[PDB]
Paper text:
Despite a limited sequence identity with hMGL or mtMGL, PFL displays a high level of structural conservation with these enzymes. The proposed glycerol exit route is locked by Leu144, which corresponds to the gatekeeper residue Ile179 in hMGL and lies in an intermediate state between the open and closed states of the human enzyme. A comparison of the van der Waals surface of the crystal structure of PFL, and a closed structure observed for the PFL-G system, allows emphasizing the partial opening of the crystal structure (respectively). Figure S5A also reports that the lid of the crystal structure of PFL is seen as partially open when a spherical probe with a radius size of up to 2.1 Å only is used, while the residues Leu144 and His166 delineate a very small aperture toward the alcohol-binding pocket that is not accessible to the solvent. The H5 helix, which constitutes the core of the cap, its hinges, but also the H7 and H8 helices, located at the close vicinity, are the most flexible parts of the enzyme. Nevertheless, micellar concentrations of LDAO impede the association of the dimer toward higher oligomeric forms and allow the crystallization of the enzyme. Indeed, crystals of PFL could not be obtained in the absence of LDAO or, on the contrary, in the presence of MAFP, which suggests that this inhibitor stabilizes an alternate conformation compared to the crystal form. Particularly, the Ser117–Ile204 hydrogen bond is observed in the presence of the LDAO ligand, and Asn142 can play a closure function even at high temperature. In the present study, we highlight Phe123 as a residue is involved in the closure of the PFL lid, which mirrors the corresponding pulling residue identified earlier for the hMGL. The high flexibility and closure propensity of the lid observed in the MD study, even in the presence of LDAO, could constitute indications that the crystal packing contributes at least in part to the stabilization of the conformational state highlighted in the experimental structure.
Residue numbers in the entry: 1 to 257
The structure:
């Protein structure tokens, strides 16, 4: 399909490919894109199939599809980029670093989906394995409580009112998410590029222990995990940590350029 793709800035320090999460879109990352451009990076943004300004039934895609999109972006750029992904997008960039290990300069994962939420019952995981096979196009609610996204009430309100944000997830995408969560841990030793993981300690959408386990599972030496005490799933707009969170990402990318 014809996706929504956009390039921002001049890639004096290289490229950073931005990979958004489930139900959102790349337009929510204007602040980070501006900061990265200001530091000398180009940013390549896209909206997943079924998300944002891209076409397709809402929420109907897969982690594998996103990785193929990343393949295409790296072919277009003609050089190794950094990857930045959040939530579903954080899981995706970790899986990309595992399955295309020599194609990137490094990977930054914000709240990557590496552990099941306690709000997601175990039978829902088993159901997704079935529905992903027999009714892959079936569209269901993602179960997300927006109040769990951020300690910033205005950020939560914006998310709710954003017309590009949706709560759909297909059977195919649900199956892909839980399957790739498992594989992300099993294949952790395949990563060769430097890694930065960023988590909020109060995140129950993607429990931080998933990142903590991954950090220990990684074999690459240049690995870093940063915790933000009290932050929810989205640290970007957190009142206490939003600015620091942005700064850590930029500083890490600058130091690895
Ligand atoms: C498809 C069968 C039922 C699937 C619905 C279960 C909800 C899955 C929530 C996925 C959340 C992944 N996330 C947002 C943390 O990245």
């Amino acid at each position: 399909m014809e996706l929504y793709r956009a390039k921002f800035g001049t890639p004096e320090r290289g490229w950073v490919v931005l990979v958004h999460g489930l139900g959102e879109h790349s337009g929510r990352y204007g602040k980070l894109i501006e900061l990265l451009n200001g530091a000398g990076f180009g940013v390549y943004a896209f909206d997943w199939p079924g998300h944002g300004k891209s076409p397709g039934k809402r929420g109907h895609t897969s982690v594998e599809e996103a990785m193929k999109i990343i393949d295409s972006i790296i072919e277009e750029l003609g050089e190794k980029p950094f990857l930045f992904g959040h939530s579903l997008g954080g899981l995706t960039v970790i899986r990309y670093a595992e399955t295309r290990p020599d194609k990137i300069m490094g990977v930054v994962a914000s709240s990557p989906a590496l552990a099941k939420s306690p709000k997601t019952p175990s039978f829902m995981v088993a159901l997704a394995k079935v529905l992903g096979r027999i009714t892959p196009g079936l569209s269901l609610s993602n179960g997300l409580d927006p109040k769990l996204l951020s300690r910033n009430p205005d950020a939560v309100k914006r998310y709710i009112e954003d017309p590009l944000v949706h709560d759909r997830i297909s059977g195919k995408l649900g199956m892909s998410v839980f399957d790739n969560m498992e594989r992300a841990h099993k294949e952790a030793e395949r990563i060769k590029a430097p890694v930065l993981l960023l988590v909020g300690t109060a995140d129950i959408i993607t429990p931080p222990e998933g990142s903590r386990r991954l950090f220990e599972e990684l074999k690459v030496k240049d690995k870093t995990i940063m915790e933000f005490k009290g932050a929810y799933h989205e640290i970007f707009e957190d009142p206490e940590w939003g600015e620091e969170f942005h700064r850590a990402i930029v500083e890490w990318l600058v130091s690895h350029s």
